[PDB]
Amino acid sequence: MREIVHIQAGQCGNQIGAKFWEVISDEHGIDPTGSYHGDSDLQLERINVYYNEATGNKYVPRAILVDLEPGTMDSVRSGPFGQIFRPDNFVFGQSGAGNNWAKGHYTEGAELVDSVLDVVRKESESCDCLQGFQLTHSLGGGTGSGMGTLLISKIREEYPDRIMNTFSVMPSPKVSDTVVEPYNATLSVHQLVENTDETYCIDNEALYDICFRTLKLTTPTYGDLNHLVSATMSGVTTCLRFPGQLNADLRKLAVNMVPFPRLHFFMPGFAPLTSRGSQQYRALTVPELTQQMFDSKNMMAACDPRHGRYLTVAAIFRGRMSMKEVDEQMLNVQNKNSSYFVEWIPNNVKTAVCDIPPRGLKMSATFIGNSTAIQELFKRISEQFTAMFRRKAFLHWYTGEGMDEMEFTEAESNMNDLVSEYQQYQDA
Amino acid sequence: MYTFVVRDENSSVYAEVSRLLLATGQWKRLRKDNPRFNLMLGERNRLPFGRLGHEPGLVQLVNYYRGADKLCRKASLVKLIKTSPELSESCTWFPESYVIYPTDEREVFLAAYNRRREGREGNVWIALISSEASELLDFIDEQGQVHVIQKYLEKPLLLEPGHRKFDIRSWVLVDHLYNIYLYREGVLRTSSEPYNSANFQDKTCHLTNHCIQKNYGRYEEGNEMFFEEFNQYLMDALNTTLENSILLQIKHIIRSCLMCIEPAISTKHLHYQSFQLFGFDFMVDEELKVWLIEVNGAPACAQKLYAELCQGIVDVAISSVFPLATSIFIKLHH
Amino acid sequence: MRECISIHVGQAGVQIGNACWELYCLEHGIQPDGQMPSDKTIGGGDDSFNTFFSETGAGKHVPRAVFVDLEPTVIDEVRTGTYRQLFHPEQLITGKEDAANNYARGHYTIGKEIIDLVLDRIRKLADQCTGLQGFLVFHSFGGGTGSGFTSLLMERLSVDYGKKSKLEFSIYPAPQVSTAVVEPYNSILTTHTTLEHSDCAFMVDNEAIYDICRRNLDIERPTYTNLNRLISQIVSSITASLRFDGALNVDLTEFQTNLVPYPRIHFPLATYAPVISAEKAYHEQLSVAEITNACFEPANQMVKCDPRHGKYMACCLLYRGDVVPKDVNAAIATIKTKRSIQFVDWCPTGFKVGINYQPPTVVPGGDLAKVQRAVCMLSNTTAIAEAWARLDHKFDLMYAKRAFVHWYVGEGMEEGEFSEAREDMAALEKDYEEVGV
Amino acid sequence: MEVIELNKCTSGQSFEVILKPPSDPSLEEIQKKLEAAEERRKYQEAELLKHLAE
Ligand SMILES: Nc1nc2c(ncn2[C@@H]2O[C@H](COP(=O)(O)OP(=O)(O)OP(=O)(O)O)[C@@H](O)[C@H]2O)c(=O)[nH]1
């Protein structure tokens, strides 16, 4: 299986989504025209995973852009790689979702969703062998969160044997738009637990902290946060995009990473951590990459890895380096810290190497972990949800769109089940 | 930081070894079933040798030699001595022995019993100790399992004062390179009650086991005479050293037993590495002839010596493979 | 002359297939285009090599081979590779989507829809056989296709060709080069289902080959290419007696007869010597004594285990190069007095020896140096059960928490098949115990 | 000691040396298994689609 269909929803979804296509396009040698101007053949070998060929010979991203507002999509279209997207893959309403999950999922989103599925079907039909879908969205707003999870439900109904994966941005009070973000996040998680196969948890708390503590940026913008996201995203999709042995498609990644169907929320990690523009001149040694990629301070989800156990780990090393030194360092980490890797999944750490480094670095490592420490992320959202929900505060925004309190109670309970299910395996 | 697991709870020797390994702070202990160890201090029974040395990036080591039971079960030791060209029936430091079953060499045993009956020369045997043949065979089928019939040593050396029997325990460490190391300290395990040539029924004056004694404690603390004292004695009474009259023979026996099984048990070209501590039990007769009693695969030490020997185990068996940031052993040269 | 069909399943089976056939061509002087100048009977023959190669009127020698993968990438390499001309398109069979490292997906889901097509293309080769003796099956234990499709294929071959012999070459999983955490599951499931359908299986542990490549070839990080050239040398040692004139192991039936007294216990250990780097500048050539002695070193074995602590049921020595019986018997006499070799009571202590005078062929510019003499030992020893013990422990660890089981249940397999497969392995481990001490 | 069964040809030779003497499922049942599994997958899918219809 080859083709992945990419969907980006809402302001956050479309902003990280645009950056993703920007970064991977440069790696595959594709320019704003859709014209290849690269040297290596490794660049084109698996280009069909993400790109359509339309005679030119031009490469068109298999990408559908979705919003309930036109704003951020006009931003994308007049942005750097804006011309590359298929204009018919732009699907927008006018009325917005007002950071309201109920509007995205039930009222405004319901009005727009069929048009999105027409574009999904049109893209799915040109595929030799569709692998499945990736979605970029946030959980804190209304469109990416409410409408994004509506879309996932409808995509699963029409394609139940395909893999569904998400890059899901979790909200934090540190970088926050509205007080209702915990409501929107809890309702979205409930969906994600049932209808995705694999979810990369991108924690805005973590991205903020990395920017503040490590990159010495005193006031991080979304741009700074998204630079970390696009690097992580390029990293986690390396094995899908380039010639390679393991985690080479979406189903094989799921089979190695997900021991129990509900526990499919991954903590990504990246090394070296770099800020935008400002370059680093000294390449990292393989021992340094390996130490940094496993460091809590390189994690994109604000969870302490020492507070849990790793179920499974995938590690991707990028650049020209010694594969023998990689195996040794990877083996050294596990042997040194063996109590943090569950002993009932043997050889639960898999490593891949790709020759092509990302732009502006000679060496990089990407970490994908399924840790039971992710539970800290869900506990945090749960705490914020309950603080409001016990006084039913802000609920009228949701009941006004037809929702009952019961739906909140159920979504909370399911998220608490997920928490305690993680705790079960951290002690087994 | 080196790692290790512990799979034998009842081992005083290894309890002390781990305690020492922890106290260097360069060794970390893991849970029983974590496969990511450098060192296994394993179980006595059914040790999973098949699962060792298949962990990439880990040099693995275990404190047992697979196949050393050929030396350490009484039935197996007899078989090993009789059938190996290096030892043979011709062997002169092992008592005449026969292997006997209930539902085998019962036939060949009774044949040698009658040549003893010919000249009526001392015809007493062990299994537990009897004068007449058919009273031993009737004890055998009464019990269940397999056991050995062995010529009993009717003229032991007897310590004065007190007309006392004894046995010598020697501790031997065989490292991963198959160097054979004899711990310089041995121990004599003495009888307290005088030896009785004409009554084998009185059993605590004939069997020297440290448990079976507890007359106990009379002449030496806990029925344990150490080396300096026994040497002093042999000089004073018999005008000879421990070295000349006994230890030359002991060193010879130890090296013969262990050179014999070396091709069957060596881990020299294997994917994992082994060491083992043995306890060799020796009897000395009245002419100062040394006889091998048995070989113990999982021995305990003597209280006074736990510290020194356990430290040596760490020094020559463990740190030799896994070095950190004089000797108490005599190397037996083969 | 009696024909053999080779069946190569999944990535491992296909890539190893490529290496074997590459080597076969070099050994028989068959060119990339498929022409064989030294063959004088144009268009036919019943020479020993025709066991493996059929012929066309144009004089093309074509492998009696079928390649099957559930995904196209790897078979597409064969299709457009240097041996593109050798194979008929109908012999190269690909699906669209693979088994995703899942036994149940390879066996139940995707197996179902391709099994009839594969068996039909096998039938096309069988129809051209005057006297088909049976099958050589190459696959991994660890892959979804290698494990899942193979076991289904084996069940069906027993049905359609019940009289015919089936031999396996099986890649046993190693973490250093493995692609999936579920390989232990796939291995046990495929072994259970395949056990009755296989007459003789040669296991090759990737760990053992990986380490041979590191220690003896000085390869820092062995690739599949390194591993496969070594594996194909061992396979060619094993099949040489089917492809060359001789009186030992001349048909598939003789493999069971000579190597397998007890039908369930059908996994002989292969040991190979010597393995010598081609960029070793100065090499002192090894004698018959030295290479035969090396057959008793664990480091030279296809599976790391300890034959001193099991019992032998049979032992064949297969020499290539300048070797004469006298030097074999002399080497055996000396080795017998230095090593622990214990046969079971109900078998003769002894060796079946075969010598082919042509030294092993090496692939030009490959990793292996040309040697004057080499040997492959095939021994049926109980010690190989150590490899089952390892696999079973790993299976038990994951299954006790039912980790990943939902992937298999979701493909239509019942949970009970896990516990059934594991029970058969417990019985197998027991059989080896009873034979072995 | 004893060498037996010696066979020689142009290509090589074989022999035996002795050191010491001694002392299926049907086509129908397969079709059945593969269709049972298909039915279990059909049922799991129909359960999922019912739940999505709710
Ligand atoms: N020795 C060797 N092992 C291989 C090779 N290719 C894969 N393997 C091993 O086989 C296992 C993976 O199985 P594959 O054969 O790749 O899987 P497959 O049969 O193609 O099945 P799916 O891809 O799951 O459909 C792992 O243990 C690999 O290390 C090869 O060329 N040589």
Ligand SMILES: Nc1ncnc2c1ncn2[C@@H]1O[C@H](COP(=O)(O)OP(=O)(O)CP(=O)(O)O)[C@@H](O)[C@H]1O
């Ligand atoms: N052939 C013989 N002649 C004289 N005395 C003998 C003997 N065999 C055994 N003994 C005595 O009987 C005791 C029996 O101990 P033995 O070593 O045979 O078995 P065991 O396992 O109970 C003691 P350990 O725990 O040291 O192995 C010895 O300490 C020794 O004093």
Ligand SMILES: Nc1nc2c(ncn2[C@@H]2O[C@H](COP(=O)(O)OP(=O)(O)O)[C@@H](O)[C@H]2O)c(=O)[nH]1
């Ligand atoms: N990391 C990141 N987070 C964002 C970005 N834009 C918005 N957010 C976060 O996304 C959430 C609001 O959702 P948004 O995508 O703007 O609303 P929507 O358009 O209705 O889906 C809040 O948690 C914001 O902190 C962005 O560009 N990057």
Ligand SMILES: [Ca+2]
């Ligand atoms: Ca011909």
Ligand SMILES: [Mg+2]
């Ligand atoms: Mg917004």
Ligand SMILES: [Mg+2]
């Ligand atoms: Mg495959």
